[PDB]
Design a protein around this ligand. Sequence first.
Ligand SMILES: NS(=O)(=O)c1ccc(NC(=S)NCCCOc2ccccc2)cc1
Ligand SMILES: [Zn+2]
Length: 258
Amino acid sequence: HHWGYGKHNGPEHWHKDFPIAKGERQSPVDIDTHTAKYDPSLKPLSVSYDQATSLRILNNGHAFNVEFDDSQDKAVLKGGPLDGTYRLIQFHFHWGSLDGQGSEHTVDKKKYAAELHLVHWNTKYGDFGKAVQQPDGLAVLGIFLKVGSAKPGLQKVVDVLDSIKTKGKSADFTNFDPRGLLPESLDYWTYPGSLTTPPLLECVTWIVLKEPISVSSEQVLKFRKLNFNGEGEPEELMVDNWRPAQPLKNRQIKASFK
Ligand SMILES: NS(=O)(=O)c1ccc(NC(=S)NCCCOc2ccccc2)cc1
Ligand SMILES: [Zn+2]
């Protein structure tokens, strides 16, 4: 009886194994665009992905992860609200059974078809494991997906999902350029929060880009053909792998833009 997204192991159950699920800085949240304050002191966000090295794509039974080589400072997030350098380790998505849901963060209660998380850890703490134990250990760059025109730089990812249908399957995934997944604008909201899956550690600076990327119906459809179950188990489609909005409590969301 492991945590998941079902009727009996879903987000309303997580607090039983992970009490921090009810804590003071949980993610995701609703972004109330009228309440977020412009902070003219937020530096521009710095995304240096030119030297990025992808290695592998993994179905972990909750999402798929594109893993990167993070043993050197090749793909880094800096500036914005961050002090110091955060190394890309992996990206993953959350998505819906239908285009009207899937995002974890919402904008004035609006759900997007999916949400991309580019996960980075603070180099000051030496590895990912130690960073998750720190209030400023991680920076997750959240990018909303809406359904329209295809995202060409996503197609390499969509085409390998056949090879990682079930939990525990992985495929070599070298030379994937994550710059293909960014929107034009780097305008963002930022707020202190948590991992959105167990163990729900309160170790994240969230940076959510205002501007969503467009993907095609056929692109998200291929996300929805993935399985939560392992090979030779009953088929449960990997859909609605998203945690709903959590109480904002004693937090301000700042905007990088007027
Ligand atoms: N959806 S999200 O962007 O908020 C997000 C959710 C989970 C992760 N987590 C990763 S990559 N590791 C696996 C779980 C945490 O690891 C630990 C590693 C060691 C000890 C304790 C925990 C990262 C981002
Ligand atoms: Zn995530």
